[PDB]
Symmetry: C3
């Protein structure tokens, strides 16, 4: 799976072990090995949410399976919790897009996952 976070929060505020933490947290939550988890954090972005430039985040979680109604609800609680505590972004100023990818549509190591 891969997780991307875009936020207007300055780089200086992103905690040092934040990416490794997200890796651990996601492994547990999706039940996928940490070896297949990729995390991408983009701070200092020029963004607005509800028309204001208060701290916000636009996130994306791509996974082959483990995506769905209940699972996504649990990912949102966990993820909003982490952004809130580590980056101090209010949970209602965060949008997370969930994508269930077909194995044939994910390339890796010179081939695909199918």
């Amino acid at each position: 799976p891969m997780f991307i976070v875009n936020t207007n929060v300055p780089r200086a505020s992103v905690p040092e072990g934040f990416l490794s933490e997200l890796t651990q947290q996601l492994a547990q939550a999706t039940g996928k090995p940490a070896q297949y988890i990729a995390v991408h954090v983009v701070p200092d972005q020029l963004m607005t949410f509800s028309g204001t430039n208060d701290p916000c985040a636009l996130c994306s979680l791509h996974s082959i399976g483990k995506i769905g109604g209940a699972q996504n609800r649990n990912y949102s609680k966990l993820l909003c919790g982490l952004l809130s505590d580590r980056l101090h972004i209010s949970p209602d100023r965060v949008y997370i897009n969930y994508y269930d990818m077909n194995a044939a549509n994910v390339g890796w190591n010179g081939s695909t996952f199918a």
Copy 2:
């Protein structure tokens, strides 16, 4: 909805209230109150379109509903007009990807929109 613009135009060429203008324009175009709109602009990018580095943009518009065939033509006219007028990007050097998102696949405020 959320709208993302990636462009090789420098940060300095992005007008001061442009994100607010985008927010207002999209609220009118989609019919969704500005309160539900997030905008993200990424300037200074390393990109080529048709093999050249003249000004260009790659955008994404995600919405829960309000997305579809004929309506996307309208969005393209509006959006390209704005980037042309404001950032001086030629319409033929702009791509916009449109995504209709399922509410169960959008996380917000600790849960999903489902």
Copy 3:
């Protein structure tokens, strides 16, 4: 089509004609005219793969057509090849997401392809 590469490799490590090379290579692989190919490269990113900060890359290829199980395996070999040779990123530290876009959901030149 449009191709995006996000990497933690430094900007100075990206060879001069890389975007132009990707344009030709893509035109060749997909059969699409270079005129319609957009390339976006984002170096110096804060990202981890498998929990480590070693060179990695997260990419996306969007196309209207020319996307399929067999074609994607082919694109992946070519693309992981170029990234290893040119940016020295190990192929097992590269993800490429593939998207077959409906012509109606791709805006260009103030309209859509449908």
